[PDB]
Amino acid sequence: KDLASATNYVEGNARVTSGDNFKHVTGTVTVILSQALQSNDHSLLETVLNNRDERVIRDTIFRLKPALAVILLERLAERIARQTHRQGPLNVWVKWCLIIHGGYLVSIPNLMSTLSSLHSTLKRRSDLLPRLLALDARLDCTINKFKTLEDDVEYNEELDDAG
């Protein structure tokens, strides 16, 4: 390399991270839900998470054993983190857990360390909101404005001569 030349920037194999990274600081499927959480069976639980019926969500978590609820909250954060497009459905699960077992969650020595993933995860969605509203308003005005805003006659000489 020419000594006059300046060394270029290369990230290489460096590990990226964020400041929120607080790791080192009938019809119910409850029994399956309790089953998979205890045994960490991703396949079994994913089937349980596939239910989109709100009444099922409430009833299942209603009977879930309160200690198992905490680990469920942790796991939903991870599954949200990997796939953000599933944010909508999974907040419902986090919601119904929080209200029903809220009394239990109060009587816990520490929450932030064990629920850090949720807080970081939930925080990210909030940081989007101010910008999206700006996008919506600009996206609002434009649509708002724009919503308001031979053979039959042919004469062929050759065919006429022919007939």
Binding site: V153, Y155, N156
Partner: peptide, 10 residues
């Protein structure tokens, strides 16, 4: 309205 069109041999 295009009432008619004429096509010529030549």
């Amino acid at each position: 309205k295009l009432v008619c069109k004429l096509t010529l041999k030549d």
